[PDB]
Paper text:
Here, we use cryo-EM to analyze the basal state of Artemis:DNA-PKcs endonuclease complex. This is the state of the complex after purification, but prior to, activation with ATP and a DNA end and presumably the state that would be present in the cell before the complex is recruited to broken DNA ends. Among the three states, the state 2 map had the best resolved tail density and the strongest signal of the catalytic domain and was therefore selected for further refinement and modeling of Artemis bound to DNA-PKcs. All three states possess density attributable to the flexible C-terminal tail of Artemis (K368–Y407) bound to the FAT domains of DNA-PKcs. Additional but less resolved is the globular density observed in the 2D classes which corresponds to the N-terminal catalytic domain of Artemis, consisting of the MβL and β-CASP domains (approx. 1–360 aa). This density lies externally between the N-terminal HEAT region and the FAT domain of DNA-PKcs. The N-terminal catalytic domain of Artemis is dynamic, even in complex with DNA-PKcs in this basal state. Based on both the density modified map and blurred map, three distinct contact points between the C-terminal tail of Artemis and the FR2 and FR3 subdomains of the FAT can be identified as the Artemis residues just C-terminal of the catalytic domain are following along the inter-helical interfaces of the FAT domain. The surface of contact point 1 of DNA-PKcs is negatively charged and the Artemis tail (L401–Y407) appears buried well into the groove between the FR2_α1 (Y2965–N2977) and the FR2_α2 (E2988–H3004). Contact point 2 occurs between positively charged residues of the FR3 domain (∼3252–∼3309 aa) and Artemis residues (D389–P396) (number 2, and 4D) and includes a sharp bend down toward the catalytic domain. Contact point 3 is another negatively charged region in the FR2 region of the FAT domain (∼3057–∼3098 aa) and the positively charged residues (K368–R379) of Artemis interact with the surface of this region.
Author numbering:
A (entry chain A): 3727 to 4128
B (entry chain A): 606 to 805, 845 to 1108
C (entry chain A): 2519 to 2608, 2760 to 3524
D (entry chain C): 362 to 413
The structure:
């Protein structure tokens, strides 16, 4: 079976001598050593979470699948059964009238975003984002982003979970598992500096509601330092995730899970920091491998010529990871990444201002640059994730509306 | 494929004599403290094991062996043979030979008991769970599934529950904790299944009391494994909707208005009651209502929709319903059997018709039959699925025209190719299902002369 | 049937098929609550046959041409049991008149028959609804929804509003007037209210009470959230209405939702609800943060500060905030095992007089639910600890003089009654209460859904405690176990081998188990006192104890064994509490054990090491100054000759004490290096003590740090030398290897952190003393990897990095030492080892890669 | 002595224990080793309330 996705992989089923079937995904022309190393990092994270009492009392574990490279151009990836893409679930939840209008219709948010980029910047390419960054105001961006958010149904995840479940108990269990898995994934991805979290990089377990993260191409600020359109977001906490907990707020279960996981991670960081140090200084992780990977896939269209140029320094990535594993402001870290990568740009000041805040509506701009507690760090992370100023200037493929 | 099927004793009087002898030995043999049974353990066990090996379908040998092993434990016969071949015979070679013979017979019985059922299974489980703790301490895993089956059947058959409880207590008390620790997550879920029935021969109240005491005595570091199976895999299942949309719209008639209700919200509980209900009246009512809803589903699917939209797709619903119908058509009951076997035959005849063909509904029916024929637990369902495959081919080759077969799914060629794939599958039950299927088709296969001259050498090579 | 036809007749049930629903709603009594759904469904569906569309067939066309034959009737035989009978073998007094009945009709053919009567679906639906509560529930809900939706088309707005108000009043009456609390009935009513809008105004108190009684908390939670979302009662915070005493309706729904979520066991949602909605002050947020950080002492202090404060600049807090504060302070005192405070708090609000009258507990329902369990638990714990007071027992006896109070005491606090009687002898009766407790556990566990993990885990802990209670009762009820010492030895071994989970069980379970076990040991010590009223009279009368003091001098009488078992159990509880990040409880238990710890050398050294471990764990989440103060308190007990005398006898305790002291010195040095002027920030005595402990002649801020680092390295090296210097047998399977692995990893981690600190910042000093660091790291990590340490296995690539950085120091050392490690311990880092083959520093891994290639 | 005719057997008091003095008045030698005692809990609401 050919999978309808990027690079068009294929699914094969292997019959073992144990009288069982083992589905696998065959990927050709794609190095997968980075994925294997990231899975090993997640296994180390799982062990650290398992040895902590507060997280063990809630069973906080990241779901890890198997990645095996057999050649520097071919490998095998374990196939998860009874799982679906988050984007696919959101699209299938919508009715025919809703789907056609978002999918194929003028004035739709996928088209309104491009129309707004054309309006605030006389360009039809990647430079429109740069011109909008230099030539737009916070009020206009916030109002336009809210008006664009208002055009997408506000209870897609809730309606989907209602439709799958048969009893209120099943709905409660599915929603709780989804929220806990997403919070753990968000905090673990922020610690590892993983970006490019669009709706096709999340897989939902349709039987239990769990969430799985896939397709780890960027690591340690690669989406904030090397992309033509930078990603100033720690993780994906969009309108649908907030609306899933309809009567309550994000300062409850998700906040508690993130705080507990961050407290577990920050205690004795030696094992984690050493493992990511061994990860970051590798002879097979040269800039050539990164540019080949980013060239093969579309992403933000990094192009054959890179404006940010080669600034690959493994010492800075591990230093930033160690800094954020201590008390540090996420806004400071992303501004440092922007300074490292986007120094020779005409919108550097606007990048820094948008990523830092305004000190009137953001809690992360009223805090010091270091020495933050776990609760304050998680609060700043949520504030930076849910900021309409940052979310209204993102890449079109990220889809900040959903 | 069931071994103890369509088989009768040559001399019915000898079986009655053996049953009377076993029942008499239950009362007489364990008497007198077994002081006098000391020199007869080996002489009894060897002959009983030889006769049981020669005749593996008689439970009386297993019962007699059960009395034999029980009397030995009061004697203590197997308290010093655990080293086995480390020392040849420090005290007595008879005890060592008896130990070795007992070890091998139990492992074979555990391996062979997976196809038995009813009385023969209850006797095999009792015999294996009455074994001394040293033999279980050798390999725990081969005896685990015996404990699980004994507990599951003891949810409805008290003596098996008592035997399993005693075996679990002995294993937890005498076997070392380090070796028994990994298996508790496999054992405790069925005790949880026992405990869940507390809302509704030793009566079940004392069985639940003993289960509670066993759970408490295990300790907090172990009894948490009581929740290992739950909240994972199947336990989440059957809690999800069969279809994300609603297909069966029913307009209840009244003299004033016609309110609309949906009958697909009743389907899971109705099928569950029709399959497994203790009371007979609710089972009959559920079976009748399921028959009515199957008729309603067929009529709604075949009805030309009044609206501009197409026919309502019943693929998801048919796929959940068709496996249940196959199970119901081969029930231990006879009202259910004569109610549902003609239903399955009629469904095959309808889905093999000229009108309803080359569709996903026939595909769903065929894959349901072919999945049932590879059931690794139920053999009656396997037989019935073989008979369904015969009927399917017989009505597929007749109803269709000689034309309208090129590039058409659900054909003779396609059915053979699925059987050929099943036959080459490394799993043991897939090959068994393919062989049973061919054994049910060959009468219809040999009649078509044109079909034979192209389907004999390939089938011969495939089955060899 | 006669009564059914009487009620279905006209002038008693209108046939307008819309007023009939209201008539059935009015025709309800709590006595028939079990069968009410089936009765109402039968009454609704009985009028379906009066429609002209009932007799005619449903589907007008068959699937194809199929001639149906004469009706086939199954053979109605007499059922027999076959599961219990001999196999391969060859009365119906009331079953013959209660045979299987049948409906509809059948017709065989070569195609299925879809041309069926319209009654062939209606009749079996109601037939199976009458014999199953769930099917009746679904049928009633579907019929109600359909009738409502169809009446929406054929009614005006005023009539629709009137009938919805009538339905809401009827549902409020249903929820308020019931005693059986049938789970299908309340679930049906609440679901029907949930799927509609005008029914969303259902009374929250009745919903909460019904869902608490019938355990339909998910249904109640769903109803409350849709009521909070879809209603939008008021969104004006300026309070446009006139000012009055009553609390807002939305916060009442929030309180009920919080109650349901607390009952279901989800404390994170409860904390979020109290943070975002109930809480309106700044002290509440800090108290909730302290509670979430498991710092119950600070949270309780803040709760009392908020409760006694009498002047508010912002404004008077709402009553919901105040009762939440009181309940949370009660929970915090329960968590801290502060029984004397818990008892006051519980008895404080009953009366203004100094002695409270406990009878007023039975006055209000609010007092019974929130104060009674805490008061009972605190008084029982105080009695079981050894204190004397009769208030609880007088209250218990006067309450069981009644019948409702006795019933609701027996329903929940059956274990407490068992312990209370067992204290005051009465061994015979307490068996009845413990059997009642076990049966109530069965009922409560069986009444909980399988999708709720937390409640079943809590009930598992409860049944563990109840089983231990019953086991002790069974042990004490027989006089044979009193004689000799073998049954006491068996019980002690079982008790020390059966422990709660350290990482997974809360402190309440440990507290209950430990208190009950200590009470049982006290009772068995009191029972096994010498028979004469004067001590040692029987001892001098008989001759056995005279010769037992000479031959059996290895151990002492039962008192010494009981004391040793109590000490070991309390130390295990202390370690569990330290692992679960509960520091105040650990401090309390450590002081209580200190009272009598200094009577034996091993007990004293174990207490000192446990204290030091707890203080080391406490230091992690504090500032540099607090770190320094904590470990400065710690350091005064590991440099004493009185315990060094015993440390000279046992080599394991010496190694552990050296490890702990090295850890203390490392913590001091790391805290000082990460914050200059921290020594100046603390008083002169502590600074002088740190200066003396440093051992540096200079008075600057760097020589002291260097001296403390040197002392830490000296103590860690001393510990590793003590471990290596034949401190133990080879000890295969790594039995006592935990301490050796700990010493290896502690020294290796200290030296590795020192090596990392030199690489990060540019070095100006020669630092020639670090030449022994990397070889030490490599060698000790290799022995730790040999001893099967997971941490060394995940820290392996650091050794390769060290080899790359400092080749001539340790390349040959690793090459010699890596050859003895098992080959299967390098599978995880196989990629690094095969990518380190074309480099100069490859000789070390050639043997390993050859070994794994061979295996 | 009032055991009573029925099963309750309500107990007037407890023969067991009743010890008047428990533990050393010294109550643990080292103040420094353990942290200051938690403030004693204080509460003074208004009694005789209806549904508080």
């Amino acid at each position: 079976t050919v999978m309808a996705s990027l690079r068009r992989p294929k699914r094969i089923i292997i019959r073992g001598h144990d009288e069982r079937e083992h589905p696998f995904l065959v990927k050709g022309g794609e190095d997968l050593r980075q994925d294997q190393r990231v899975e090993q990092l997640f296994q180390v994270m799982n062990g650290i979470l398992a040895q902590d009492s507060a997280c063990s009392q809630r069973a906080l574990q990241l779901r890890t699948y198997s990645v095996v490279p057999m050649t520097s151009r071919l490998g095998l990836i374990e196939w998860l059964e009874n799982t679906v893409t988050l984007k696919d679930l959101l699209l299938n939840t919508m009715s025919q009238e809703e789907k056609a209008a978002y999918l194929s219709d003028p004035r739709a948010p996928p088209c309104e975003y491009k129309d707004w980029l054309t309006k605030m910047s006389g360009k039809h390419d990647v430079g429109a984002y740069m011109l909008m960054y230099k030539g737009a105001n916070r009020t206009e961006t916030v109002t336009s982003f809210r008006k664009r958010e208002s055009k997408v149904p506000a209870d897609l995840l809730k309606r989907a979970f209602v439709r799958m479940s048969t009893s209120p108990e099943a709905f409660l269990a599915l929603r709780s598992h989804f929220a806990s898995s997403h919070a753990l994934i968000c905090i673990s991805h922020w610690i590892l500096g993983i970006g490019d979290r669009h709706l096709n990089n999340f897989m939902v377990a349709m039987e239990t509601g769990g969430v799985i993260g896939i397709d780890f191409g960027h690591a340690f600020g690669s989406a904030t330092q090397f992309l033509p359109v930078p990603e100033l977001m720690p993780f994906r906490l969009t309108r649908q995730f907030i609306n899933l907990m309809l009567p309550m707020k994000e300062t409850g279960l998700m906040y508690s899970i993130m705080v507990h996981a961050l407290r577990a991670f920050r205690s004795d960081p030696g094992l984690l920091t050493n493992t990511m140090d061994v990860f970051v200084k590798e002879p097979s992780f040269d800039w050539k491998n990164f540019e080949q990977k980013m060239l093969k896939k579309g992403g933000s269209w990094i192009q054959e010529i890179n404006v940010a140029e080669k600034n690959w320094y493994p010492r800075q990535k591990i230093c930033y990871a160690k800094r954020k594993l201590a008390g540090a402001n996420p806004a400071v870290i992303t501004c440092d990444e922007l300074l490292l990568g986007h120094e020779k740009a005409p919108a550097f000041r606007d990048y820094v201002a948008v990523a830092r805040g305004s000190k009137d509506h953001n809690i992360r701009a009223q805090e010091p640059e270091s020495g933050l507690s776990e609760e304050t760090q998680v609060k700043c992370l949520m504030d930076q994730a849910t900021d309409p100023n940052i979310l209204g200037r993102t890449w079109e493929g990220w889809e900040p509306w959903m | 494929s069931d071994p103890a099927a369509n088989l009768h004793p040559a001399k019915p009087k000898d079986f009655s004599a053996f049953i009377n002898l076993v029942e008499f030995c239950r009362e007489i043999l364990p008497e007198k403290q077994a002081e006098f049974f000391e020199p007869w353990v080996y002489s009894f066990s060897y002959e009983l094991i030889l006769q049981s090996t020669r005749l593996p379908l008689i439970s009386g040998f297993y019962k007699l062996l059960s009395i034999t092993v029980r009397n030995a434990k009061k004697i203590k016969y197997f308290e010093g043979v655990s080293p086995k071949s480390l020392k040849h015979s420090p005290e007595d070679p008879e005890k060592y030979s008896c130990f070795a013979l007992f070890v091998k017979f139990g492992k074979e019985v555990a391996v062979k008991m997976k196809q038995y059922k009813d009385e023969l299974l209850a006797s095999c489980l009792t015999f294996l769970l009455s074994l001394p703790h040293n033999i279980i301490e050798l390999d725990v895993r081969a005896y685990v599934p015996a404990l699980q089956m004994a507990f599951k059947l003891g949810l409805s058959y008290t003596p098996l529950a008592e035997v399993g409880l005693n075996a679990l207590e002995e294993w937890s008390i005498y076997i070392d904790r380090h070796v028994m620790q990994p298996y508790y997550k496999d054992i405790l879920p069925c005790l949880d299944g026992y405990l869940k029935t507390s809302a509704l021969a030793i009566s079940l109240e004392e069985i639940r009391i003993r289960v509670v005491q066993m759970l408490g005595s295990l300790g907090g570091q172990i009894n948490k494994n009581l929740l290992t199976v739950t909240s994972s895999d199947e336990m989440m299942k059957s809690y999800v909707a069969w279809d994300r949309e609603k297909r069966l719209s029913f307009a209840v008639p009244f003299r004033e208005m016609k309110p609309v209700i949906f009958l697909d919200v009743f389907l899971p509980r109705v099928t569950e009651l029709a399959l497994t209900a203790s009371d007979r009246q609710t089972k009959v009512a559920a079976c009748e209502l399921l028959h009515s809803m199957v008729m309603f589903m067929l009529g709604k699917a075949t009805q030309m929709p009044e609206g501009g939209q197409g026919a309502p797709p019943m693929y998801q619903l048919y796929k959940r319903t068709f496996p249940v119908l196959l199970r119901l058509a081969c029930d231990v009951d006879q009202v259910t059997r004569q109610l549902y076997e003609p239903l399955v035959m009629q469904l095959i005849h309808w889905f093999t018709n000229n009108k309803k063909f080359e569709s996903q509904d026939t595909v769903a029916l065929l894959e349901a039959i072919l999945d049932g024929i590879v059931d690794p637990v139920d053999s009656t369902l396997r037989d019935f699925c073989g008979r369904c495959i015969r009927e399917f081919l017989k009505w597929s080759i007749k109803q269709i025209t000689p034309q309208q077969q090129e590039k058409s799914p659900v054909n003779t060629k396609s059915l053979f190719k699925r059987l050929y794939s099943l036959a080459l599958h490394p799993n043991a039950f897939k090959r068994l299902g393919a062989s049973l299927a061919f054994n049910n088709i060959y009468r219809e296969f040999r009649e078509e002369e044109s079909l034979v001259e192209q389907f004999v050498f390939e089938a011969l090579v495939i089955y060899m | 049937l006669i009564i059914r036809n009487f009620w279905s007749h006209e002038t008693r049930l209108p046939s307008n098929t819309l007023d009939r629903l209201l008539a059935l709603n009015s025709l309800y009594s709590p006595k028939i609550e079990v069968h009410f759904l089936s009765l109402a469904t039968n009454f609704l569906l009985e009028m379906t046959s009066m429609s002209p569309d009932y007799p005619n067939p449903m589907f007008e066309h068959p699937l194809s041409e199929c001639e149906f034959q004469e009706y086939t009737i199954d053979s109605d035989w007499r059922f027999r049991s076959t599961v219990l009978t001999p196999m391969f073998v060859e009365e119906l007094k009331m079953k013959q008149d209660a045979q299987v009945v049948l409906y509809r009709s059948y017709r065989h053919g070569d195609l299925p028959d879809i041309q069926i009567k319209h009654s062939s679906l209606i009749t079996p639906l109601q037939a199976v609804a009458q014999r199953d509560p769930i099917i009746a529930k679904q049928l009633f809900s579907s019929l109600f929804s359909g009738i409502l939706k169809e009446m929406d088309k054929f009614k005006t707005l005023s009539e629709k509003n009137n009938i919805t108000q009538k339905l809401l009043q009827d549902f409020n009456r249903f929820l308020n007037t019931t005693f059986s609390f049938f789970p299908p009935f309340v679930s049906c009513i609440q679901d029907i209210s949930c799927q509609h809008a005008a029914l969303l105004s259902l009374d929250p108190a009745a919903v909460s009470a019904g869902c608490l009684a019938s355990l339909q908390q998910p249904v109640g939670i769903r109803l409350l959230e849709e009521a909070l979302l879809r209603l939008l009662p008021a969104e004006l915070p300026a309070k446009r209405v006139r000012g009055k005493a009553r609390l807002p309706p939305d916060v009442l729904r929030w309180v009920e939702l919080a109650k349901l979520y607390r009952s279901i066991g989800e404390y994170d949602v409860l904390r979020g609800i109290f943070t975002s909605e109930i809480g309106t002050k700044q002290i509440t947020q800090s108290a909730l943060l302290a509670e979430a950080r498991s710092d119950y002492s600070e949270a309780a202090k803040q709760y009392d500060e908020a409760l006694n404060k009498q002047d508010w600049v912002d404004g008077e807090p709402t009553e919901a905030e105040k009762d939440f504060w009181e309940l949370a302070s009660l929970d915090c005192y329960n968590h801290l095992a502060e029984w004397k405070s818990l008892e006051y708090c519980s008895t404080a609000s009953i009366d203004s007089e100094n002695p409270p009258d406990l009878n007023k507990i039975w006055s209000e329902p609010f007092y019974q639910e929130t104060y009674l369990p805490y008061m009972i638990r605190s008084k029982l714990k105080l009695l079981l600890q050894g204190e004397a007071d009769q208030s609880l027992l007088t209250f218990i006896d006067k309450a069981m003089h009644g019948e409702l109070q006795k019933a609701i005491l027996e329903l929940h606090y059956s274990q407490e009654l068992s312990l209370l009687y067992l204290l005051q002898d009465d061994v015979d009766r307490a068996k009845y209460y413990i059997q009642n407790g076990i049966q109530s556990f069965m009922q409560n566990y069986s009444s909980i859904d399988v999708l709720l993990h937390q409640s079943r885990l809590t009930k598992l802990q409860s049944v563990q405690a109840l089983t231990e209670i019953q086991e002790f009762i069974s042990f004490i009820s027989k006089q044979g176990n009193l004689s000799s010492q073998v049954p006491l030895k068996r019980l002690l071994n079982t008790w020390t081998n059966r422990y709660p989970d350290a990482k997974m069980d809360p402190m309440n379970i440990w507290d209950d188990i430990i208190t009950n076990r200590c009470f049982f040991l006290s009772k068995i010590e009191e029972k096994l006192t010498p028979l004469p009223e004067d001590n040692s009279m029987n001892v001098d009368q008989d001759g056995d104890p005279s010769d037992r003091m000479e031959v059996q001098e290895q151990e002492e009488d039962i008192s010494s064994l009981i004391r040793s078992c109590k000490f070991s159990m309390k130390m295990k509880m202390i370690d569990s509490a330290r692992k679960q990040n509960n520091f105040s409880l650990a401090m309390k238990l450590l002081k209580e054990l200190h009272k009598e710890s200094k009577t034996r050398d091993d007990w004293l050294v174990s207490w000192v090491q446990s204290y030091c471990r707890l203080s080391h764990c406490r230091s992690r989440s504090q500032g540099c100054s607090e770190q320094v103060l904590t470990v400065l308190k710690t350091v005064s007990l590991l440099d004493e000759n009185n315990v060094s005398s015993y440390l000279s006898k046992n080599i394991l305790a010496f190694r552990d004490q050296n490890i702990l002291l090295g850890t203390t010195y490392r913590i001091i040095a790391n805290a000082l290096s990460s914050e200059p002027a921290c020594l100046a920030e603390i008083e002169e005595d502590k600074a002088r003590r740190i200066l003396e402990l440093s051992g540096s002649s200079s008075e600057d801020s760097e020589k002291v740090i260097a001296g403390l680092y040197q002392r830490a390295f000296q103590h860690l090296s001393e510990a590793v030398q003590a471990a290596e210097e034949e401190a133990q047998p080879p000890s295969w399977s790594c039995g006592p290897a935990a301490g050796v692995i700990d010493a290896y990893m502690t020294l290796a981690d200290f030296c590795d952190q020192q090596l990392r600190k030199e690489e990060e910042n540019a070095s100006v000093i020669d630092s020639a003393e670090l030449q022994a660091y990397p070889a030490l790291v490599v060698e000790k990590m290799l022995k730790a990897l040999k001893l099967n340490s997971n941490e060394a296995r995940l820290k392996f690539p650091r050794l390769l990095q060290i080899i790359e950085r400092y080749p001539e120091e340790t390349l040959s050392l690793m090459t010699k030492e890596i050859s003895s490690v098992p080959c299967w311990q390098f599978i995880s880092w196989i990629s690094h080892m095969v990518a380190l083959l074309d480099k100069d520093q490859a000789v070390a891994v050639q043997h390993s890669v050859e070994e794994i290639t061979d295996n | 002595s009032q055991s009573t005719e029925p099963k309750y057997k309500p107990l007037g008091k407890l023969k067991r224990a009743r010890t008047v003095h428990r533990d050393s008045e010294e109550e643990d030698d080292y103040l420094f080793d353990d942290p200051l005692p938690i403030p004693l809990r204080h509460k003074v609401p208004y009694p005789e309330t209806f549904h508080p």
